[PDB]
Structure formats: structure tokens, C-alpha cells
Amino acid sequence: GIKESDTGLAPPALWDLAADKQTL
Amino acid sequence: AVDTAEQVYISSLALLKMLKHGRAGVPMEVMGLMLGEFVDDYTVRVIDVFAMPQSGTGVSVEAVDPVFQAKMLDMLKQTGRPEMVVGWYHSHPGFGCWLSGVDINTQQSFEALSERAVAVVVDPIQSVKGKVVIDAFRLIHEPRQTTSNLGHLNKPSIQALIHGLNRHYYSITINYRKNELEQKMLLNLHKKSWMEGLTLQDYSEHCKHNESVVKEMLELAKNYNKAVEEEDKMTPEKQDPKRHLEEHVDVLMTSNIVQCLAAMLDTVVFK
Amino acid sequence: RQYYLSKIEELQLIVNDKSQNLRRLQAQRNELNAKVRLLREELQLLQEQGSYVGEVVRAMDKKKVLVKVHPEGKFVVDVDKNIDINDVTPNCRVALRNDSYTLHKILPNKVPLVSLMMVEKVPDSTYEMIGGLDKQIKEIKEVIELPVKHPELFEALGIAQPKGVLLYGPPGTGKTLLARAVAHHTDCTFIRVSGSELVQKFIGEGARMVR
Amino acid sequence: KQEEERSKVDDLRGTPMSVGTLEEIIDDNHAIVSTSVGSEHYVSILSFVDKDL
């Protein structure tokens, strides 16, 4: 399998919705 | 039918204002409006173009002075131009035909204006030396394509695709409304006059031109004695003697024969 | 008799000669047609842009390569449809796409300015033109001619190979001459750097020219 | 799997990705960051990022 290179990111239940897209 | 790959026609008379305005405002995204007609669902033609002076806001809806345009349309329709405004254009010096955040909002008003207004982008500084960079765009999957016309065109360029159909807007293929009258009129700009075609250049300068190649022919003659001496059938490298002999021969002969021919004709005409 | 059997001899010669004369002109036209196709695609390929240069450092994910560009810093970059990402070793140096970054290809064997220090033509200097320094020649060979020829001897002593050589002393005594003569005989790739070529100007010109 | 997220947040991280260095976390949703050219930028924070820098 491929190895992660210290990229972060939280689980799905903790981000996005339309809020982030509208803000950006 | 809900509009498709479609087509846009621009008059040559409209085109030259597109470039002259662009090359006038080399520091700024100068803008203006087009008069034309949504003649049918398959194409739109534009005839005549008027640029309009600077607004400190740059490209925007408020860049349009309602007083100026209304009287400009009023003056134009009086002098025989009753066409409505079918689209707006602005310059993008230094970058290709694509729509920025201000442009998409600016165009979005224009579709909100009547039904299907179209924008035009000109990049007058890279549109140079015979190269032209113009394209038309409209906002909203483009409706059902029924002809390979847009399949013929190059797909949206990367510098425009980075801001391309992900912004749900698309290109419309440019086309030109030039006619036989305009074609020969523009051709007559550079068409040679009789005394111009009968000019004998300069005999001393002709010798300078003759030496400028004959001296080179001495080297390529030596160099021709290199290509023929490496006949071992090695890897391909046309260069040095082979080609450059033939182009220089072409220009040299046509220079001498025409100069002598015109002088010979001059010898016959004038006595 | 001599109409069906006469035309297919007296005029068949003409039609075959015409076929061959047409064949030579067909080849001549095909040359110019391939040439004009070449020139057209030449113009069209003269319409994209250089897309600068970058270096891969990690394939953090498929379609998401970490790269480091020449003037600026580091970015996440995807690759063209060839997308042979696992072929891409870090520090390979690669060619990108112009905008949205993205990657075009892998480029050939890496080094460009750094290539300039490698000695193309070895000097004529030869050990036979150095007098007396034979002992120093052996003391340089033990760190040059011996290890590149006999790592087995180092293993048979079990010791680590020497790392480098410092030629010091008075100016004008042969260290330059010995270096030039060594370039003539080591037959391994010889690269040379003036001490003042380094550090130089703009940040990284010290980093890049050593790394 | 997360193909819905792959269809949303991968698009939010529209390629390419620039790399810089943070210096201030003044807002829980806006930080202030530096980059290669040495410029400084007050920028927004998207919620999927780690709360650590």
C-alpha cells in the first residue's frame, strides 16, 4: 500500500458543509 | 432549441476597433460594447463596435456610463445603426481569453439583461505579428450538441481551462463576416502600385546584396565538401551545406533576374 | 489484329512511362506535404509555454506529487495522462505544465550549471612532467588509485576508506599540476570547482551549488 | 468510501497546492501565513485542516 507523507486532515463529521465552500 | 455549440460572427469592421482600443489601453483592461443581433439560435453576428472611456473601477457593470451609451446608441441609431447591444468586450493584456471573478459577474448581468449576451476577450499585446487571440464566452453541461463544429476547435486552452467550464462558462467559435468588397479594399492597402513595382532598387546596393550571399556561398562550397566527404551513411543530423545552399540560391537568383528584367523593361519603355 | 495487339504495345509503353513519371512527382509532393505538416505542428507547438522546471521530492499520493520548483518553493502537483508516478524517483528533476501547475513529463538524465564543473577535456598534464613528487604521488594514489581499484584491500583491513585529501603548502609548488595530471589518468569522471565559484549571489546559490 | 468527500473537499483543494509557513492563529477560522516570496497573508482556515501549527 501507499504511505502517507504527514498530510493531516480531520474525519468527515468534522468539516465542510456549505459553510467552507461559501466562505472560500 | 436551447443553444448549442453554435457560432459567432464578427465583422472585420468590428474587429479593428477591438484591437485599436486594446493597443490604446496597453496598461489597462479597457472595455467597450458591441452592436449586433441574435439573428438566430445557431449564430450571432456583430456589426460595429464602440469603445468607451476609462472608469476608475476598471472592468465592471459600473464601468458603463448609462448617459454616454444611451446617447451613443442614440447618435448611432440616428446615423443608421439601430442595432441593440448584443455583448460587451474588454482587454486582457498579458494573459489569454478567460473570465476573472469580476468578468463572470459582469457577464452574469448581461445574461440577466436580455437572454444570451456574449462577452469577448482581447489580449492586444500577444495579439501581434499576425497572431490574434480572441474568443467569446457565455455562462449558464452545454445543451445538446448537434454538429461536430465545436469538436473541430481546439479544446479550451489550459490558461483558460484553469478558469474554464468549472465556472460553468464555455467558448463560442469566432468567425468573420468579411466580404469581397472589404477583402479587396483591405488588400488594396498593400497592393503594389505601378511605379513601386517598377522600382529598380539600387545597383550599388544590389552588389552589396550579391556579395552578402556570394561570400557565404564560398563557405557553403567548402561546407559542401564536408557533407559529401562524410558519406559513411551515419545518423541524420539538411544542416550546414545542404539546405542553406538552396534557400540562398533562391533569393540570389530572383534578386538578379528581377533587377535585370525590370532594367531591361525600363530600357524598352522609355524611348 | 494490329489494333487490340498494337495499342497495348505502342501505347502501353507511354502509360507505364507516365505512371513512373507520376510516381516520382508523387514522392516529391509527399515530401513537401509531410514537411508542411511538420511546420504547421511546429507553429502550433510554439503556442504553449515553458511551464518552468521543478524537482520531485515525495509522491505523497497518486496524482498529488510533492515537487520543488526552481525559483520559488514547494507545491503539490499532478501528472499528465501518462501518470507513471512510481517511475518518478525523488530529485529526478521534471517538467511541469504551465498553469494549475500539473506535470508534463520526467525529463532525461539530470545534471545544468552544475554540469559546467565536470571536466570535458582532460588536460595534457602527465605524471612524467612532475619531478620529485613521486612520494606525494603515492600518498595521493593511496586515497585515489588504490580505493577505486581495490576496495577488497580495505575490506581485508576492515577499515573505512579515507574521505578526502587536502593539498596544502606554499603557493606554486605543484598541487595544481598534480591535480591536472590526475585528471589525465584517473579515468573516472573528473569534476573541478574554483573555491570562489561558490556561495556567490542570491540565496541558495551556496545551497544549490553544493547540494 | 469517501467518494462524496472526494467529490467535494478534493475540489475545495483545487490543485495546485502552495506551501508556506504559519505565524499567527489569530482567528479560529483565519490565520496569518508566510510564503516563499516572503510576503505575508491573512487567510481563511478551512475546517478540515488540523488544529495544530
Added chain:
Amino acid sequence: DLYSRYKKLQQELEFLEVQEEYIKDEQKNLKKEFLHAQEEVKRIQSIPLVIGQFLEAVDQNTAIVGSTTGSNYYVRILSTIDRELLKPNASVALHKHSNALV
């Protein structure tokens, strides 16, 4: 039987005459198109060109070059640029926008 071959002779004489008749027209047309293309390629290397430093030859037609703007670019070589003049120390001129080596 022998009638058919004479008829084929009659067909092929005129067919090949047609062939040559438009092959010469095609020769002239392709000469015109070639000259148009080459005047375009010469127009490429006209005058408003940036200066850079030739770094290395990626392929027979493309190379890495180092611009005086500071950035280095993966750049097409102009075919007429005759190769032996090139060395990693050869100062070169590039098209302003495509950055192509001209």
C-alpha cells in the same frame, strides 16, 4: 478479351494525365503554403525577445533554458537553430510569451 485491355489503356492514359495535371497544381499550392508557414516561423523570431542561457538539450527539439528573469524553463527549440553553436555557456534569445528558444 483483347478489347478489355485496350479499353484499360484508354482509361489509364487519361487517368494518369489527370493525376499529373492536379499533382502540378498541388505542387504549386504546397509551395505557397510552405512559404506562408516559413514566413510565419521567421515572424516568430522577429525582435521583441527575452535573453536567457542555454542549459541542456532535453531532446532533439526541446531543451532546458535559463532565463535572465530568474526562472528556468522547459522550452521548445526552434528547428532552424543549428545545433553545434549550442553549449551550456551559449547565451540565447527566447520568444517573449511562449518562452520558446528562437
